[model samples]
Target chain A: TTNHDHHIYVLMGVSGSGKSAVASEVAHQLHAAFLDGDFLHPRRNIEKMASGEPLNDDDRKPWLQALNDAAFAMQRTNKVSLIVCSALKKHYRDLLREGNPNLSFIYLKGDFDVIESRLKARKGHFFKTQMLVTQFETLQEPGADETDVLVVDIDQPLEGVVASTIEVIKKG
Target chain B: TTNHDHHIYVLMGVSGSGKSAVASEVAHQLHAAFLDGDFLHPRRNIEKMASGEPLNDDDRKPWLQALNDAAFAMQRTNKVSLIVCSALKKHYRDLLREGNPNLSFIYLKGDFDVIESRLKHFFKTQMLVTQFETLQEPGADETDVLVVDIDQPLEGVVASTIEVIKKG
Candidate 1:
């Protein structure tokens, strides 16, 4: 039997960085399962953000744990899995990586002005445009040794971003 | 290659009827995934029930839809899956059955005094012993229904329930 390594791809970014859109398409292209990390957020956290309140790390602990569990579950069943997460901080990514050491991250890098505009245009989401600045401030770009990560610019079209991500995943 | 038929088993009962414990074991024995119905409850419904409020039909509609979706997803993947739900009312079961017409229900039946005693002993749950009075007993006693009496020990009860479920 042929051996293929299982990989858990964490699509990390701020709210407006289009992590959901690009990661979903990447998963489809790879014929893998796509998990929306926002689905695992607790109702309390969703309500707090919907009320335009920026969540502290304390508020995100349970939500992160749930997403980690979901990613871990997916990895156990499938060869390649895509998870869209706002893993803005090193600690957040570390927690998810702990669930599966074979985890790789796709950081959706984008300018604040562009992302903020996108946030304003979003409809019916719990995250508000007012929280964009806090998200950017919370974001910590991945250092060279911070696990395997592909820092792709989100300013490009959706297809281009997904193509770059798929290329990196294939080369690995 | 041989084809395997898909099955979705719904374990139905009111609180304290041992649906959760039994259905979980059944899923393990059957090598299928288990979904707890509590996970599908919206936070609003959980908060209301935690405050000793009995949810009306309106509050339950969304929660039922979420559970239905979960069950549908599971059935779409594995050959068989188990869902533990307090499908006390006929309408609720009917709603759940709508998701998969071939769904099977396993009703956990127990005496009121026995179930009430167990509910009183349970801790930190939103479901109160008083709510037991409102649980609809108009459950369909379908001829092909899988019924297990909950008057035995947990180990014995689970064994019997799984045996009956597997048998039926």
Candidate 2:
């Protein structure tokens, strides 16, 4: 039978919201696989990616497919795959669910001002202040109908967030 | 003049009680330097370290002094030096303290059973069974030392350690 007994949790949030850090801690605690969704982006395979360049549906479809494929594959051994993606659009979120039965999204909800200080000003593939505003704008907040999305407020400290998140995952 | 302004915390305990893990966490959280006291032992450069044998005072002195000298030296650059040492005897601890002011010991107290289960690698060694017998376990007279019960998980142990260290 072609069936995965394991689960896949996408840690969906805007950049700089500690998706990677939180996902890593969750994976460690849950003994799951940790995957940063940025690795799915195709820019590094070619030329230097401009910070201002937009990611279109074509650029993102393969990336989401790879995530689905990876989460599906890793679930053979791992109990869960804790992955990150800023799946801000409803359409993108739907794409991630294509034939992915056990997949769910943990939306890390936080104010932009609360997280802006930690954003990338460092080097290649930067997050400018304007981009964050656009991210919030682009976000189609999960509705009541989207029961698969488990949202959590990340306004507290890391340990508290992680502990409570573990509880949520355990109960959820 | 080196006023011994900086602090050096020796994570002291019987081996396999999570001294190194606690010390590393303390070092990371406090933004300090970390040193494994075993590195001071001359055995690695020489023959293989004997888990079966005992360490005499003659063999122990250089190691103790190296900890002191290294801690004293590390103070120039780091605000704190988190070091590991299984200084089971009072005299050995005293040897570690010689000329090294601002030094404190954080003793990790735990029973053999819990610690033994965790020491999978050190199981081959006789030290796991032997360390507690030799451990003096800091007392009332040992005012410079702090005791942390490491029977809990690493996260809680480190949390309590950081709390106690900050309170001091």
Candidate 3:
């Protein structure tokens, strides 16, 4: 609520992790703008995914960079940004934080079975259920390795998870 | 060049300056990537500039953030990045420095008359000569400054600038 005009929240988790849900509510609470990090993915990467193959590090790297760029752009507007992304690796989070010490990430975590089941229930998304397995395979959890990152389990209600997430950010 | 990466180069100058030339060349020499800071401008601000109205702080804030993201991208690849643009204000420069501490800027200092002259010579390129006047709010020269006097053929004759730039 203070006049400090700069804050960026990176909503990150594997596919089907409910990152988007948690991110949306957090953005609402912070009065921050929400960005779908998937929009940053290049056409080729999306096409590859649409064709049912998972993207490799080479593919994801540029998309991750694009997300970082979007986060930076939002901050430049003097508006806090809340990004919904599958920031799978430590390197990706570090890249987001670089040059942006104010940048923070909320890692949504849940059982793969639960995520897969949820994905099956959700409809009209390009990320197919088969690909959900690949997402789990590719994920490299942030572990206890980051100061600006918070891992939140996605099994909780959206509002509860968002509130808990916002609390950690305030403490930060 | 040794196998160890150079990683950063500054594209420093005032508005209407020819930093793009130096930045491009530096990127070529160091085998680093190149990023013109202007490409990061939000669509609205770019439209304003194209319409001949210079942007205020509100417009440029997000653009600089995009530039910082570009720098961070380069750092991730372990490749060098040569960014070309006018870092007219110190606070603007500091915002950049915040993202990539290894970053550097090669400031191109020339008289307003000279800058105007250069702009006229490149009139066909859709110039912003007025912006050169508008964004020229720089203060007293600081230590990181790399002065390129317009009267001198520094780019042609002074090998030291590149040498010092690379080493730094």
Candidate 4:
């Protein structure tokens, strides 16, 4: 069995960084609740994104709080959960950490061309290619002491990525 | 003390029928959880409505299920709750009733001119003028319904609804 703890795992990355896929896999392997942070966005936020407008911090504050609440609920019931979010800035991370101070992040790192290719290949996703640059620009790479984080490169295969995530989580 | 039965109150109406405004008051009066059905809609449904497409039964099934889940959660916790949904059809009401057979509906009925004017006067609401055209009116007359009303002044209407809901 994995060495399980109460820390909620948030898989943070840009739009095309495979957060949903990896996070879902981690939740399944851990037998924990899985929440897609996108679902927590309000109607206005969805409309803004559909219109290709990047959500300002004001638009995101309530959404992050809702996601954090859901994460806390998961922790309350199941002791752990995996949430996927863009969480591209220090303030955003700070907002999320407010809910669960022991929250750990798994930052999925990738090159521009690599993520862009994947985004082009993606189908029916709301986040378009136009938003990728904005996402990377908004991203504040987490420092070692910022929070308990595990940085994993997206260049590796899917199995390798999830395996690495599971290993780090287990060690914790 | 208020008579707090295990009644799940659903304020059913069309786009501009004041379900949110009144249901919130009833929930407050009863000290119950108030769930806005609009918030239960999926992102795709919101996009569809934003593009001026009225949601059909298929598009609404999952959303209705989610609202029912929320209502059920409320019932599980509070023993009584108020939920606002268009519930535009008998089948939709039936779907919702499947969650709790003891469900009660407060149908808000209004004339085309009144509801249309309200729809126009409203600002930034996702439900647009186009939606009112497609709102089914079969829900106008439901038997054994808790309460029904013609749209009126906001202040008076809320009091009337809450009182009728409390009485019925």
Candidate 5:
């Protein structure tokens, strides 16, 4: 098997889904490398977007490619790599899967209403509901045929999210 | 009024105390910086007892100072720096505290017999019994020192550590 023996996990979810924080502790426990998918965004992507003008697939290609390259790069270090990404679409998830059998996605799933209310608690700042709603619409919910996908409920405490994510990853 | 708007935490305990794992999760939870004090050991200290020697104060001095320095370094960008260390003795804890007013220590407490039993199972392992023999148990007078019992299991231990950090 190539120079790498470890797997790559994408902690996928929409904003307020706890992907970043959950993935952070998960990677720590498993001793995996971690990357925040947003950190891979190109200047052009950052310069545009919104609930104002939700990004189309055309706008997302480079970012996904960057994350894919980064995944391979991190796997080279001999530790599992857990990347935080929203991979809310089947096509996006498929894009990441191409040519990397070792990659899998852990979808941080939760109700739209629960996530919206949770967002309102962030240091007294309220989240604008539109963008999150868009993310939910964009999400495909990983059907039965998507065997590479694992789902974790985000409606619980962070400890539960982390513990359960680790359990599923270990079980698989 | 203090330059150190942040706090430094010493995740102190013996070899099998789960200091590193628990502290890593605690740090990630709070967006705090995390350090394993084991990383500061001098080259000479490592080889003599890879599983960890019963390091006397003499052999531990440099590493303690290094950890103290590292603690200060981490606080630059962190609201709290959680440093995993085996500060089994009061004197070692005091050394880490000197001139660092924002610093505190959290003792990851567990039974001697249990920790030893853990070491027996975990290689890539350690010498845990000596660590207890050396532990001072953080007398209550050291009010800045917090305690989180490990018997509650990893999830609860980490939850308690987080609770302790927030309340402290």
Candidate 6:
């Protein structure tokens, strides 16, 4: 096991950007745990999204907080966790960061066209690809203060993206 | 006064970061009215923080909704207001943003040291500051976001900040 203290790895990106696939790889390589951030979302929120309705901020608050607490809890026994999260906005990322100083965001940047296409190809997902507009409209890009963040392209092959993220952790 | 549609500016930042100061400026510059985001806070929250207590996600729900309504009404042509809001969390901002798409946030960013110093200088306001800190935090450095330096030389003083802000 890595001798370092537990650290949080946040896999954040827009919908259908392969956050789950990449996060799983990161966790597997590190021999750490993986948490599907979406699973923590409240049933109400999941229901609403399942019915093709986007969740309001009110609906999302509890869900996000639960995710934050869950990820933070991994710190015990120095448990590293790779969490797959669609932290759409800078503010959302901020909420997760609060009180969790070891957390770092891994942004899976990609073309809207490609991501949207991918989402269209997939089904049975809670969040719909049709909601892409609102997601983009709400996205406030991470800025200078967030230097610890790793921004990588999702258009690259899965192995390429995973390898790049691994290198980041090694250097960091 | 300008006859255009009313503007809703969310004066946001962590506690002791001078949200009140900048909100006053924005209101002054626009000749609009100002409201403190804190005043609308729920009594339970106030009491909770007054006792140096932190609020969980559940406690903040109603209050965030209230702020959304506050910004929504202010967005109407019937009203134009510049609010001094310590919209500390992104969820709160998203709440306010959803309520009033027209609403804009002016984030006041400061170092922990500066804010803590202000807290130290005004120690008597400890309870109040604690509540503010419980809510206001960093991570608002993104959009609908603006920064004002409390540690800088304060030169060209208000003029430079105002100019950049206005043009923005």
Maximum-lDDT candidate = 5
Off by over 4 Å in 1: A1-4, A116-130, B1-168
Ranking by DockQ: 1, 5, 4, 3, 2, 6
**Pairs with backbone N, CA or C atoms under 3 Å apart (clashes), candidate 5:** none
Range of the 10 consecutive residues with the lowest summed lDDT in candidate 1 chain A: A1-10
Error of 4 at A88 (Å): 0.4
Q: Fill in the DockQ of model 2.
A: 0.02
Residues A49-73 of candidate 4: C-alpha lDDT, one tens digit per residue? 6575677889998678766655654
The residue ranges of model 4 lying beyond 4 angstroms of the native Cα positions read: A1-5, A120-129, B1-168
Model 2, TM vs. native? 0.48
RMSD, candidate 6, Å = 20.7
Residues A1-172, model 1: lDDT tens digits: 1113767888998877888678756765676766666655555565576575667899889777766665655554468878888898999988887646767898878878777655556576455555687777788989998858887877777788889888877877
How far residue A168's Cα lies from its native spot in candidate 5, in Å, is: 1.2
Best by TM-score: 5
lDDT of 3 at B93: 82
TM-score of chain B of each: 0.82, 0.87, 0.75, 0.79, 0.87, 0.72
In candidate 1, list every pair of residues with a backbone clash: none
Docking quality class, candidate 1: incorrect
How well is each residue in B1-168 modelled by candidate 6, as lDDT tens digits? 122355576767766666655555544455454555554445456557556667777887866765565455344432446666677777777877673555666655566656666544235456555656566454535466665665542333234346545766
Candidate 4 TM-score, C-alpha based? 0.50
Give the poorly placed runs of model 3, Cα more than 4 Å off.
A1-5, A120-130, B1-168
Give me the displacement of residue B90 in model 6, in angstroms. Answer: 41
Better of 3 and 5 by DockQ: 5
State the fnat of candidate 4 relative to the true structure.
0.00
